[PDB]
Amino acid sequence: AQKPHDRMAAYLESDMAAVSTLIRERMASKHAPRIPEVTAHLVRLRPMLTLAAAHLCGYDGPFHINLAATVEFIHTATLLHDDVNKSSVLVGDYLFSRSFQLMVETGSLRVLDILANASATIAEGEVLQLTASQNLATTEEVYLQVVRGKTAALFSAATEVGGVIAGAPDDHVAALFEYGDALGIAFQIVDDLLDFQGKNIGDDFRERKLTMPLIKAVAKADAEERAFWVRTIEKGKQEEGDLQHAIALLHKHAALTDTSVVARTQAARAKAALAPLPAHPVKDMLVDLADYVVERI
Amino acid sequence: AQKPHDRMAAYLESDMAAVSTLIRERMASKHAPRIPEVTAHLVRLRPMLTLAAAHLCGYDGPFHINLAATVEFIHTATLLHDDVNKSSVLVGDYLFSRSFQLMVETGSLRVLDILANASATIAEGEVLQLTASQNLATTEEVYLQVVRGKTAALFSAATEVGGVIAGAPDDHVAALFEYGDALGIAFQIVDDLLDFQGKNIGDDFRERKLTMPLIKAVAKADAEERAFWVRTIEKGKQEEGDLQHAIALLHKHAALTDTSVVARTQAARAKAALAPLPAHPVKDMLVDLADYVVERI
Ligand SMILES: [Cl-]
Ligand SMILES: [Cl-]
């Protein structure tokens, strides 16, 4: 999957350069000089999705660059905010404001709607996460909502705005959205998976954050096992030996193999969502990307 | 100034109701139920400026309601963020996202530009504040920038978008902007003033936040006085007696009378900025408002 991944990068090489130029130039604040030391310090596939999607639909113009920059600004600002100290909040807010300026300059209300609704979903997931983390009532169906918010919504928006700015027909656009949604879900399930499969390991477990493997394990917990889950997640109390026991319970209940399967299934869904589109070298790159996202499992 | 202030309220009575309905209905999150307990708990002249400005320019339609809601969403989200714990950041971000949805629905790229640039100014001030707070190099001219960001930019944007959505000519719009800018500056200088003039008192002093009265005092500090300023602001070290001494130095250097004068001058500037506009009952309300903002000094 290496040479296939490199081809996408090399094709988008120039646009990625010209984006990362914008990110650089807009992180520069007219008045305050106390920003660029933090922004440069913090500065990818999300902005790549937007450019790829634009080229796939034959876009000549300049605004795909704006939109891909917006996409990264939004991802970064969201990261800062999760790392919560005062310096983060306000710097993220700054990037949000800058992201908003960039989309407005494109002249497209449609993409603004798309990114406005996406930002709603993202922020809505972040809060849903607060509640659903450390809460053994959480179904998988509820975790998928969390995943969309925290992860997939931006993927799907990134790809969708790339098609919209290109002026693509509504079927091509829905397919771009579905590609990005499924790819984002796969992307995040892979992360979930690798937090167990071979510093990193058990992180979600200590964090008391309900990953899919944990949901699938808890879903089969007898009284004995429930007490263990009730204790290390909802009470937060953990000791020596507790990570090894959690992992044993995952394996006992096929929680990892089964999560691997959902990952692979969403990744196949991504590729299928490209089907109706007419053939195109970027179409191929996006297929390879769907495989690349799940290669590590 | 009471009956004159009440007339504005009573004229805008219905629109304010119908806005606070929106704020209520959009704070409701489809999926996550862990928001409305915080948003209702947190929910004014800013949204009033937008409605007033729309009516002043003869706007029939519905979007002045959207825009005034956006204005409050933005003010609130900004408040939350300054109060920084994790629950704040994400709830504010949620209101920002919701504010963005509302402006997009208006169909006006111009107002989006206005509010996108304003959001930039606001966030840019917040960061400039970090540096300029606890920094005796700060001139008044630098404080005015802080004031615009933290305060006036939203006033001026609130009034300006009200005129733009109404479709008013460019001269009427610039005057609305200038009214709101000067009014916001006056508004904030008044706050600065009342943090000394008669729990509240000395707050900015303990906070090591460079209010205008402090700038004007420091600006005249000899070596003896500088050492006192260098110590209680840049070193943060304060003892018994230090507030009384600061206040003495303000009076010694006419720092309050002089700040009062800048307040009054900006408020007169606000009213003058309405001059070219044709006469109108809301025009009168905005004049009274300019006097009302400075009545407490
Ligand atoms: Cl397994
Ligand atoms: Cl004085």
Automatic annotation (TrEMBL), chains A, B:
It comes from the Bacteria. The keyword Magnesium applies. Belongs to the FPP/GGPP synthase family. GO terms for molecular function: all-trans-octaprenyl-diphosphate synthase activity; metal ion binding. GO terms for biological process: isoprenoid biosynthetic process. It holds the Pfam family polyprenyl_synt. This is Octaprenyl diphosphate synthase. InterPro entries: Isoprenoid_synthase_dom_sf, Polyprenyl_synt, Polyprenyl_synt_CS. Keywords: Magnesium, Metal-binding, Transferase. Gene3D superfamilies: Farnesyl Diphosphate Synthase. It catalyses: 5 isopentenyl diphosphate + (2E,6E)-farnesyl diphosphate = all-trans-octaprenyl diphosphate + 5 diphosphate. Its cofactor is Mg(2+).
